[PDB]
Design a protein around this nucleic acid. Structure first.
Lengths: 109, 109
DNA sequence: CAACTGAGACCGAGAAACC
DNA sequence: GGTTTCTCGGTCTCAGTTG
């Protein structure tokens, strides 16, 4: 669908703190991934990306759909793991840190 | 695909767990031993065999590789029992606060 | 100070809905 | 067919509470 182009556009936009690359080829990038109870959680800051994917696919209409960051992140994560265009480098992801992040590589084809 | 129901029924019909017995012939209500770990009368091996068996069934524990954790096993089994739609708790009949405390659970068709 | 608890959050793996 | 999403049956995390 649009996941590949949408995600690379969102990383290139820079409007999401933590959504950055790792090299110049832009084949490997980071993505913020916080739990919803770690205290340092800002609802409108960390869920923004997961909100955009709900707005881009019509899964969430402002004013006509009650907010739900859980299912937003659920949808985006399921589509990201099941996509054959992204491979999560499990060893390079950093989970037990301050403001965690996950490392992905886009496979070209 | 839900192994909790059949596994619990097998562990009850086997009878190798003292206290894990039925209370009726329809096999729809049963007793489960629920002792606190802080008590001196808490035998760490026998009073936690079922939670350890649940950890071993779902591959959560491997003897000789991981460190034993009876509290986490108890927490896991309790969360599975509360979240599952099959077993429901009869708190009014649980009859805790006896030398051999227990919980009474009911099976739902 | 461990052990325990419920409630909300999370997750991977089919089974669908969908382009 | 390829792609995103919905189900589902557990598990995880946290702020409390209890022994």
């Amino acid at each position: 669908g649009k996941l590949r182009q949408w995600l690379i556009d969102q990383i290139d936009s820079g409007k999401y703190p933590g959504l950055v690359w790792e090299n110049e080829e832009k084949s490997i990038f980071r993505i913020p991934w916080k739990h919803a109870g770690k205290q340092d959680y800002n609802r409108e800051e960390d869920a923004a990306l997961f909100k955009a994917w709900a707005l881009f696919k019509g899964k969430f209409r402002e004013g006509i759909d009650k907010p739900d960051p859980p299912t937003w992140k659920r949808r985006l994560r399921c589509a990201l793991n099941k996509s054959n265009d992204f491979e999560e480098l499990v060893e390079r992801s950093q989970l037990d840190i301050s403001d965690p992040y996950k490392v992905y590589r886009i496979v070209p084809e």
